[PDB]
Design a protein around this ligand. Sequence first.
Ligand code: ANP
Ligand code: CA
Ligand code: CA
Ligand code: CA
Ligand code: CA
Length: 467
Amino acid sequence: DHLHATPGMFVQHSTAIFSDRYKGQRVLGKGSFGEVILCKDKITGQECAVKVISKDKESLLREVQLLKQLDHPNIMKLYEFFEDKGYFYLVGEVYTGGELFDEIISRKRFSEVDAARIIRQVLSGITYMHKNKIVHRDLKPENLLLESKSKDANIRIIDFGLSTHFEASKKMKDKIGTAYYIAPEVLHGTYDEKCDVWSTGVILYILLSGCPPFNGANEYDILKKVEKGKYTFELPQWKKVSESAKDLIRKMLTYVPSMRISARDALDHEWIQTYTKEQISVDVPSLDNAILNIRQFQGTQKLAQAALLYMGSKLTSQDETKELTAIFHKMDKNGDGQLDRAELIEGYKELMRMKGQDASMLDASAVEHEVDQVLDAVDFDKNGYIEYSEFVTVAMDRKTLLSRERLERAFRMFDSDNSGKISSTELATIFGVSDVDSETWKSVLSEVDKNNDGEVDFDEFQQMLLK
Ligand SMILES: Nc1ncnc2c1ncn2[C@@H]1O[C@H](COP(=O)(O)OP(=O)(O)NP(=O)(O)O)[C@@H](O)[C@H]1O
Ligand SMILES: [Ca+2]
Ligand SMILES: [Ca+2]
Ligand SMILES: [Ca+2]
Ligand SMILES: [Ca+2]
């Protein structure tokens, strides 16, 4: 019955029709014409990518349920999922840099420093997925999108159509994937999440050499080579490549699954952790402001909590969140895309150092105490970590977040029956729960309900957040 807010809970919540929220602009990307479309949010102006499917049914809902559970800077963001009598609409964050595949086929080779940045990002994404008991099963350059045409463009893992939850008690069986990238043990039909590490190793091999490690004339020929598992670093193709990169590839293409490196350990591999010593630059004012915002969140009621998370997780662009994203990655010491307690502690210590404060001025456990309070307050879903959307929601300048349009969008999202007022039932529904506690609704009303009708109109909704 608990009210734990996640970005995922908003995805299928809209009572509205697709065409009443979005205006179609052009086709987007290089696929079959008209299947993916660039659209503008009619209220906010926000551009998005809409996958339109004419109506297969069951598996698309599985995909949506998985994407809803995932909130990571290297995983595609899903905004909304609509269903008509004739169409499904998957509305997502737009990534304008095209597939990694297309960068590969347009150049001989990636430099080690360039391949490492890309692979770090993939490994950050799948370390997070695996920790959440989700395996991708179709990692390949086609399913990695670049966020923009910029040369520093972040990588997004997409196309979770073949993805599933996995358990330690039973093995996966489905002989599923794509020939160049599929782990030998998938072919044999008993496997675990290490199948994703193999696929990622193949991507890495291709990035550094320009060729697949298991090749052939057709799908059957490719699969026999994969089954056999034998690969080589042919000279002179590989002559200039460092031993350390080869070491990583050797670990990720390790044939026996139990001896293959995990995604977390690959993320922690020396080649990944040492490829650069460049530090992300964050100015004192911005970090200080972020921490300020973060620590002041304690005590917020549930309607405001859900409203803010909707706005931060669904209605903010990358351009709008640039500084906060940089702060997030700076604080994310192990680079797994989550902030844990230890990392938050170091974030506080870092700020103190930057501001020229004396740390010993505080008692030994002063920082730990602060972080324990911040954690309870900012960890929306109570999973013990601060995820990217939780962080941005709370760390962003509140006046910036609460634009007129975001406010309208948020209100209409909660006001399911379009009555002009938000009810306790409408709050219960958005949280995906059967009933909201009588106590929880009361704590909302005592702060927000200015005219004592037991519901929240647009005027009170604005005041709740703005004042
Ligand atoms: N969020 C997004 N931003 C930008 N481009 C995207 C996004 N999602 C998908 N695409 C692109 O849209 C194209 C089509 O993908 P998809 O919708 O799976 O159709 P497809 O690739 O033709 N295969 P299928 O959908 O199974 O018929 C690919 O180039 C994708 O990279
Ligand atoms: Ca982390
Ligand atoms: Ca959390
Ligand atoms: Ca209503
Ligand atoms: Ca009222």
